[PDB]
Design a protein around this ligand. Sequence first.
Ligand code: FAD
Ligand code: MB5
Length: 444
Amino acid sequence: GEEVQVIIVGLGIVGLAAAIECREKGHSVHAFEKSNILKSIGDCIGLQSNATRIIKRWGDGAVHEALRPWIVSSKEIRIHNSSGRLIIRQDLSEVCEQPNYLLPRSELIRVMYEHALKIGVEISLGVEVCEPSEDEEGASVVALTRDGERQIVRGDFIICSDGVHSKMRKAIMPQPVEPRPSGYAAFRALVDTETLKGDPEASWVFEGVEENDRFDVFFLSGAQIALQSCNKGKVFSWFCIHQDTRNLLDVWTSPADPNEMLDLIKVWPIGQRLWSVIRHTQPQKFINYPLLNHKPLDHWVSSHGRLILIGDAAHPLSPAAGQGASQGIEDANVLATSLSLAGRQRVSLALHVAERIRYARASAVQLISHRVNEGWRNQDWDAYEPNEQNIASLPLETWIYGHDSQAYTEQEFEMVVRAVQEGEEYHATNLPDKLRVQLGIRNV
Ligand SMILES: Cc1cc2nc3c(=O)[nH]c(=O)nc-3n(C[C@H](O)[C@H](O)[C@H](O)COP(=O)(O)OP(=O)(O)OC[C@H]3O[C@@H](n4cnc5c(N)ncnc54)[C@H](O)[C@@H]3O)c2cc1C
Ligand SMILES: CC1(C)c2[nH]c3cc(Cl)ccc3c2C[C@@]23CN4CCC[C@]4(C[C@@H]12)C(=O)N3
């Protein structure tokens, strides 16, 4: 009559989603995180309908109501050239049939953190998790606190949601493959709303944002720039994908030079108008984040089936594509659903079923996102005008954003169990069949 004891390593977006999913489905959760995750860092996170579908269930709608101010109200993407001329209005009516969110990462973390505490997730901040182990009966980790004290923590299995620099990953894949640089990076930041207000030369950016979030894209030679608003103009954010061969580290903390962005855009006719807004980014908030191409791992689940990698620990995606967080939320939902269907006496089965459901779909999104990183969409803008051909269409694919991962898992669970127990390949239908073979995805 004892609950499953879930251990979670890392409380980024995916670890918090895994904690909420597991706890709402009746399992005990003790989550560990090394940092103060409430600190204001990073810029905005987008969540598409495949993620909001999952989030809508949490607390019988409580989290969705907390996130309602952040529901995307853009009806179109406005695509501009280097003169600022509007070339194409790309309709978002289908993409936005169901809710999407756009909000500062720190606000999404806060909302998820508060709900996790409310529903009884046990959270331990200031803990670096080390040295996982497992056998046929259980798993354990070492909780290392900042005073150097070590505490053993035991559970039924370990959820490794510790991000792109996951140290848990080597417990599954001890020989790490190296991501290769795409040759591109992304400048990105929030704008300081206060100083943005009160700049008369930036007043244009507020037009209509109380009714429809701004979603402007600009294509210049060497730059793909987006300017967005959310929550009725309370927040403005921007990014700029650009060529960069420097040896940049993929972290969200390093100093970046705002003058590099000014130099890139000031030589084109629209540059001064864009800078009228972007100049109000706080200097220490400029991030220049490299767009690295990570190869799918061979698998996500450990030898005894009591550790699983999810989120960016399993399938890091660049922030340039828009499915990174949403796919990690699908990991959390499928894993928790699979655990609930398998039960405490079949934990390894649960993790292996979740891996079989998630792997090909997550890997397809990952491999397609490599093309956005390498700039395949770009053309010579002296000759071509940008249009829908140049917009990475991953956030526009119905097969991604229309998907209901929980319903899929419930309907397919016993078929996946049979594939796992009979040693047969499971052919998931949560991605297009042509895609899996076209991309060279190898089933686990
Ligand atoms: C500080 C920060 C800012 C970010 N800002 C943005 C942004 O503006 N836009 C965007 O699109 N993406 C951003 N990201 C990335 C984004 O969170 C992910 O791409 C994705 O949405 C969710 O990935 P995740 O939860 O799997 O991993 P992450 O979000 O990277 O979270 C991993 C967590 O695990 C913790 N952790 C790592 N190792 C250990 C350990 N041994 N023990 C305990 N805890 C550990 C880390 O402290 C971190 O909180 C940011 C990530 C970080 C870490
Ligand atoms: C910002 C992204 C993640 C995005 N976020 C969305 C949200 C909704 Cl709700 C609908 C569509 C999108 C898109 C499509 C975008 C628009 N950007 C223009 C330059 C680079 C990029 C990235 C990508 C692109 O090529 N396609």
